[PDB]
């Protein structure tokens, strides 16, 4: 073990603080006040949280704030195993901590901030979460490709808009998890892990393939 | 030609990107299916635009991220690609669109009106061709002007500009024709659902709009 | 007179083609299908039309597409009087031409694409249009200030978002004109010039002050 | 100090920009006044964010475009401005907010609930302070991190990032507290309407959130 490296602890700490802010703001927007109409607001808040916290903390920790993105970075050999494990631990702790506050301020059980299923089987929910996270991790890896000089725009904005796209595509079927750490928090605070594995198998593989297709196939 | 990896990886990027683009856009098309109220209008516009704004930022360095036979034809008219590259691009776009449509219609049901099929809502085909043509003209004109390698004033996110152009074409054409501006996007669901009613409108419109945007930008607006 | 200069005719022509596309797409979005809910859609379409046509034609004509912006540029001495007059003529012709098509494809008289008044006197409507165009022309002039090197973002996107902001602020009071050429088209095709001067005095002065406050006061 | 034009033009830019910011945001607050449905929620978020995303792009080269006493205090905690500049900034922001509020409430009526006044909707003041504090913490942290002159990875539109941060703070706090994250924005209407109920929440929240964001970014996250 023996991590050390003072800047590495700040990377893990930036992931923790950013995950707390990310989950607090996104769940506070979801639980704000039917749901089909509210979907647009929820998508915008979840995208802008990434588009802001990445622009604020990417130079300090890469601003993953997503275990699927962290696994996509680990599959691309851009971080170490120890750094990825500590990243996921910090993201899960920040997500549970912020989830406790947002579910403390709280419509009975409506709670749109809990990844459930709405019209799809778990076998289909895994595919929906997998493609909705594949596009996200592919965007994160391609936009952070150090071999490119054409990215003259806001990369955190591109990643946040990718999250918002995954929401626009997956919030009506599975609530759009695309973030195992964001699906654990509410499931831990409410103590409801029904169909929770769908929001872990789906995103993670979607991230891993996003690395493998990008590196070992698309852009060698 | 038919070997150099830079061409085949471009075709493969077109296939993967078109599959992701159509899957993500069609997943927004169904979902809450019912009601065509302005909030659904805006949401569908946003999803269809952000799919480009993400997949272009992810695959443009590999294939230009056309994901649109009208954009591919506009690039062919601008002499930026070859005919063989355009043919393989259009085939890849149609295949990716049909495949993603098959998956989305596997998760969704039959689809009475579905809305994920570009149809007509209050306009004749003579008017629908004009609406689709101008809505694709602005898109291909934007793509060619923003990717003009003779410009140094483009200091913003070009995939974001193209995605916002798609979103604008939706905001302007989704209530009349559903906004196709992509023959492959209008082909996928029409192939899986086996419904090609007024399908020629969404090929004549986009293709001619892209070729005209190319000629007006190059042969008129920005010469050479 | 004798304009000449081949590139100047292309500047006027780019203004004409861009104005036709701008008015067609924006009015087609407004007349698409109550109104308070539709406001968001109308604002987005009107902002994205600028954010796209500027990114497509600014290197060819500056992409004014707005007589208030053209007057703000003329007050800043960035264009000539002949070029500004020809610009306004091209914008008015393109607006009337596109307005004829959009009002040809057309709810009785609802027509949100016609600048009317909804809860404000003309004396107040002039102030609303003036500030809503002041912010726009100020943004256009400041973002196109050739003495700045900090503008590392999409300037057409900033201008389009300024238009969208003017819509979010003025569409419920006056319908948000902030464009004398965009207020003339529908008023000419429908032959209804009631309170039309409000949508000319308001924006123009709002643009002129935007120049004077920026140059002769804020940034000399 | 109290002479050099670069300081006074900055204060004047703060005044003009705050007047435009509050006028444009409050014009969105009234308008259709009634109903607090998610579409009004999103629309108010967009107007309040785009006002920053435009006025910052217009006046940041002249004054940094704080337009927020919490952002000004966060910059003072980051030692990027002096105390005199911060005092003149806060005075200019309060004056511009009150003036624009007077104009907007001249075009609008009395305002039963108005919504253009940051109040409480389902949370205690102890919870409202936390919501306003985190919603301003993210904003000031973003402003300081994106304007860190030691970074070269900020290749996007910084005023757009700050405006989207304001829009996010609205999407997260407008249903609980109306989203203040700007003491001057919460002061203007409260001064013109003469209603300072729970006004201290929208000063303790934003100010402390900005100072904490400055200390956490500088003294912890990004040293030196």
Numbering used by the authors:
A (entry chain A), C (entry chain A): 2 to 34, 38 to 110, 112 to 225
B (entry chain C), D (entry chain C): 3 to 226
Authors' description from the paper:
AQPs are membrane-integral water channels that are present in all organisms where they facilitate passive flow of water across the membrane as a direct response to the osmotic pressure. Here, we present the first structural and functional characterization of a fish aquaporin; cpAQP1aa from the fresh water fish climbing perch (Anabas testudineus), a species that is of high osmoregulatory interest because of its ability to spend time in seawater and on land. These studies show that cpAQP1aa is a water-specific aquaporin with a unique fold on the extracellular side that results in a constriction region. The overall structure of cpAQP1aa shares most of the common AQP structural features; assembling as a homotetramer with each monomer forming a functional pore and consisting of six transmembrane α-helices (1–6) and five connecting loops (A-E).
